[PDB]
Amino acid sequence: TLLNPYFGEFGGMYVPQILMPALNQLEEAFVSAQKDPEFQAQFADLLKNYAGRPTALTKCQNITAGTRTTLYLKREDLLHGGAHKTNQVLGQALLAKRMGKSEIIAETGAGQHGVASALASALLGLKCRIYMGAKDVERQSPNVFRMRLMGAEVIPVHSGSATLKDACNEALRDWSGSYETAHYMLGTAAGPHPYPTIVREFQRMIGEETKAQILDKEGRLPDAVIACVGGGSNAIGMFADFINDTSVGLIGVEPGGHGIETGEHGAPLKHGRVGIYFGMKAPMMQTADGQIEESYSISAGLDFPSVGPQHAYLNSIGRADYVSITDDEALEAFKTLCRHEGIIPALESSHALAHALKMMREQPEKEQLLVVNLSGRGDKDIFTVHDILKA
């Protein structure tokens, strides 16, 4: 390989032999594109003029009132498509074209990556095929028909938990038979190398902009940046540019679901065990026997029984810290942002916000400057949240 597939013990390329050429082709295309000024210009142009970068960094003064916490929100909810997923999808689509692929296979849970895949494919002339768990088709329905309006085929997956893991499995199976014409647009910083690396580099502008914006507004770096962790893309996009700024805490937030003690959660980094699946060596939720467990979250986007290898590594060395937030804590944060800042956050992003609000409330006289990655908007979640209100 051209690049290191591992982050400490975590990562690698644990795919069938048939798929290694595709992975090698992708790696070579990426390394080449990174050195290509024309690629970089085309990518920059789509991000700025199509997706609407740079996104805002909003100071939330109402929600921190009466405390010594200053909170900013990095507004990826304002990105075209409604989430940070759009960033790296535009980059991967350009790599797909560079590799002469005409088709796109993707998987989606919250439907935000699926929307992103569909819009990029519509824009750049690719045929897009999307796997989504049938439970997620229901609970994240507005996204299902956004995808279909933009010319994408949406394929409901009924097997297993009928959520994200099962969508991934189907997408992987499809790709192993169609890699010659189809690029697999993996939607997070996980899976086989080179995906964890590529997804980080194409999400890295989140942290770079945040750094420039916070220095401009505050004259210094944040005490901590805080992001939810599904597979790890929005978090690593935020974290990446701060990794060498040792004074800046990096907090990743896994879904605690109904509570860690119930086993109905999606927190394998802190509560799972290293395993091999999804093409990588990474923490997973697994039985004693080594079968992969089903995860659970109120949010479809965090409902995944593994995590990307770089977060597993940053945790092990102590550089980043990971915590969990329950369904109920995420819901309170959702309601709080709606009512006091007039922003409706995705339920995924609400986990990140919830933890920030905990840091504030637990120690209200601690002076802290925090940034939360608001990875998406919550329009897709409004029916779900409505139905829970009542009871």
């Binding site: 390329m13 644990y14 069938p16 032999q17 048939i18 038979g177 010659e180 699946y277 992969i292």
Partner: protein, 266 residues
């Protein structure tokens, strides 16, 4: 060893191997053991056996459902090893290969897994989601416990891969019929002669063709192309699922098929 003797004997009788695949414990421990006995009796030269895994990423719906049935019967990897011991105890010479996914091997330690394979009398292990690129700790553990590590030669294989597979592999070389996942419905059409010849040049372990082989004509074609044998999975498993109501009519329909497939290898 058992593979070596098998290919030696098959060479002398100038025929190819027929190697069926089933999921251990599908549809139950006892019926599976009877299914396997029927397979060997009907003319199976070796066996390829899957341990039920939650997420079989290289398998289509047929074998997916095979895994599900075994899971409904509550089949664990520990029970699979107990079955393997019983199969070896009844059949001392037949080569036995396991189809594994990496997590089941890595779970309790890679070394311990192969030590256990040796202990029960397994001859080879193929880990489906470990390419040569990640194979080192797996192939080292295999060789330490006298287990053949099985490597895959795909249709898109280049010369560098051909030589890797040839030196690292033991027992047999898995020659893939096509891209995609396991499935009887999808047959591999591409000619594989040039890959078969090069493996022989670099002195790879004898080649077995697998994926999509569901008819005696396909077996015959594989052997006539120079491959040492053929593997059939989903075709066999379809007979299990379509005859779940009829255990006796299952074994008869299994027997007919395996005989017909083995005949084609002659």
């Amino acid at each position: 060893e058992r593979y070596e003797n098998l290919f030696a004997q098959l060479n002398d009788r100038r025929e190819g191997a027929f190697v069926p695949f089933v999921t251990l414990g599908d549809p139950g421990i006892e019926q599976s053991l009877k299914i396997i006995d029927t397979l060997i009796d009907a003319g199976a030269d070796a066996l390829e056996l899957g341990v039920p895994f939650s997420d079989p990423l290289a398998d289509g719906p047929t074998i997916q459902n095979a895994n599900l049935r075994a899971f409904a019967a509550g089949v664990t990897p520990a029970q699979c090893f107990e079955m393997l011991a019983l199969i070896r105890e009844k059949h001392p010479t037949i080569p036995i290969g396991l189809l594994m996914y990496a997590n089941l091997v890595f779970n309790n330690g890679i070394d311990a897994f192969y030590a256990r394979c040796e202990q029960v009398g397994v001859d080879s292990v193929l880990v489906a989601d470990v390419p040569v690129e990640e194979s080192a700790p797996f192939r080292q553990a295999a060789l330490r416990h006298n287990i053949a590590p099985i490597f895959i030669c795909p249709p898109n294989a280049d010369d560098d891969l051909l030589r890797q597979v040839a030196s690292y592999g033991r027992g047999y070389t898995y020659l893939l019929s096509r891209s995609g996942v396991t499935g009887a419905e999808n047959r591999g059409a591409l000619p594989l002669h040039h890959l078969i010849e090069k493996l022989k040049e670099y002195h790879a372990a004898p080649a077995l063709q697998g994926f999509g082989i569901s008819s005696p004509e396909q077996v015959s074609a594989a052997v006539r192309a120079g491959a040492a044998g053929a593997i059939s999975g989903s075709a066999i498993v379809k007979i299990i699922e379509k005859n779940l109501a009829s255990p006796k009519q299952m074994l008869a329909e299994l027997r007919s098929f395996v005989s017909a497939m083995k005949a084609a290898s002659r």
